[PDB]
Amino acid sequence: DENIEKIHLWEELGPVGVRSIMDSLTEIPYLHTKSIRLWKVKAQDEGTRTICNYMEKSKTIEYLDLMDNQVGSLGCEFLGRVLHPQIEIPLLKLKLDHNEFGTEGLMQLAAGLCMNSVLEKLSLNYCAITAEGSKYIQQILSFVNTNLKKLKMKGNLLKNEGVHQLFRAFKVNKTLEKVDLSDNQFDTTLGDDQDPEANPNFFETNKDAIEHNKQIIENICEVLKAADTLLYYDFRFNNISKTDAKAIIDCLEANKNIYYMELSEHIPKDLIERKKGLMKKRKPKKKKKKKAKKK
Amino acid sequence: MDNTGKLEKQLVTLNDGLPKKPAKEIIEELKHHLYQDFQKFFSEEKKQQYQNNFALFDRDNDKYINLSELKELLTSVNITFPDDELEELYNEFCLTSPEAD
Amino acid sequence: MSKKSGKGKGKNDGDELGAEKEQVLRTKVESLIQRLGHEQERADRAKAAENELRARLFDLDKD
Amino acid sequence: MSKKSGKGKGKNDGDELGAEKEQVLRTKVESLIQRLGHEQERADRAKAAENELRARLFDLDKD
C-alpha cells in the first residue's frame, strides 16, 4: 500500500515505452513521486516532453536523473520550457551528464533555467559545452537572487575563455558553494616550449596568449580571495601550469575557508604537497547525524 | 461534560516551509517576474534604445557604469531623483559586484 | 558414498525440465547484463579518452 | 455472438504461468542481446575513435 515516491531504473525503455509510461503518469493524479533516476534510459525529446507535461500537471516531482540518455536539441527545448518560474515546479536536483547537446542544448535549457530558481544541484559534465555558450552561465552568476547550491562544469569545451567568463561572473557572485570545471580542455601551460634558444623570438610574439592567461590567473586569485562562500573546486584532468599552481597556492593563503579544491596532476609536486598540507586544516567537521531517541 | 475544556491558543510556530536550497538561484523567480514586466509591459523599442544608449555610455565596453556615468544614464533618460537614495542603491548593487568597478 | 542404490523415483520430469529452463534463462540474463555493464564501462572509458585527447595532444605538436 | 458464454474453463493456471514466464525470459534475452550489441558497437567505435585520435596525433605528425 505504498506509493512511487522515488524512481530509479537502469534499463533502456524505448521512446514509445517511455512516452506511454510518462503520459499515463500525467493522466493519473500521482503526486507521491519525489525522485526519479535513470542513466541512459534515453527519454530523448518525446520522453522529456512527457515528463514536462506530467511535472506541469502535477507539480510534485522533486528529483530527477537523466545521465547518458542522449537528450537532443528538442529535449533541451522541453527542459528549458518546462522550467519556467511561474510553473512552480518542485524539482530539486538536475543532472544531464553524457549529453552532447552543446551550445544549442545549453541555450534551450537557459531559456528558462538560465534564470530559473528551483533546483539544488545541476550537473552537465562530459557534455563538451562550448566556450561561447558559457555566456549563458555568465548571466546566471550576475544575478543577485541566489538560493541554489551546485553547478557541475567538468568535461566541457568552456576552455580558457570559459574560465575567464566564469571568474568574471564569480566577481559578482557571493553565494556559490561548490563548483567543478575540471576536464574542460582548459590549457594554462603553454606547452613544452621551455628552451627559448630553440626559438629566440618565441617570447616576443607570444604576448596576447600569455598576458591573457596571467589575467585569468589573477582574476582567479581575486575571486578566491573575495569568495566568502565558494570552497569546493575541481581542476582534475586539466592543463594547469606550474606557475599558475604556485600563484594559486600563494593566493589561497588568505582565504582559508575553502574546505576542498582540486588541481591538475602535472602541477609542481612540492606545490601539490604544500596545497594538501594547507587545505588539511580546511576540512569541514563532519556533523554527526543526530539520532533522535524514538519514543 | 462538566465543561472539561479546552481551548488551545494556536501559535503558528516558525517551523514550517523552510527553504532548503541555500545560495545560487532560487530567488531567481522574483526578479524574473519583474523582468517579465519589461518582458511584458514595455515595447522592445525602449529596450533597443537603452541597449544602444548604454553601449554608447559603456565607453570601455565593460558593460558597467560608475557613479558619475550611472547618473549620466539616469539623467539622459530624464530621471529626477534625490542624490542619497540613488547613491545607496548604487552602493548595494556594487556590493552585489564586489570585484567589479 | 560408493553404492548406487537409486530406488526408482519417477519424479515430475516436466517440472524438473521447466525449472532447468527457467534457471538457464536466469543465468543467460545475468551474463547478458554483466556483459552489457562491462561494455558500457569500456565505451565510457573510450569516450573519456577521446575527450582527453581532444584536450591533449599538445607536447608533440609544440615540438 | 460472443457476449455471455465466457464459460469457466478450468485451464491450468500453472502451465500458462510457466509458458508466459518463459516467454518473458525469451523477450528479456532478446532485449538484453540487442542492448549488448548496441553498446558493443558503441564501445568498438569509441576505441577506434580514441586510437584515431592518437592518430590525429599521427596525422598531425605525418603531415
UniProtKB/Swiss-Prot annotation, chains C, D:
Gene name in the database record: DRC12
Compartments where located: Cytoplasm, Cytoskeleton, Flagellum axoneme
Family: Belongs to the DRC12 family.
Coiled coil: none
Subunit structure: Component of the nexin-dynein regulatory complex (N-DRC).
Lineage: Eukaryota, Sar, Alveolata, Ciliophora, Intramacronucleata
Residue ranges of the region described as Disordered: 1-23
Entry function: Component of the nexin-dynein regulatory complex (N-DRC), a key regulator of ciliary/flagellar motility which maintains the alignment and integrity of the distal axoneme and regulates microtubule sliding in motile axonemes.
Parent-protein residues present: 1 to 63 of 187
Protein name according to UniProt: Dynein regulatory complex protein 12
Organism of this sequence: Tetrahymena thermophila (strain SB210)
Start-end of Basic and acidic residues biased regions: 10-23
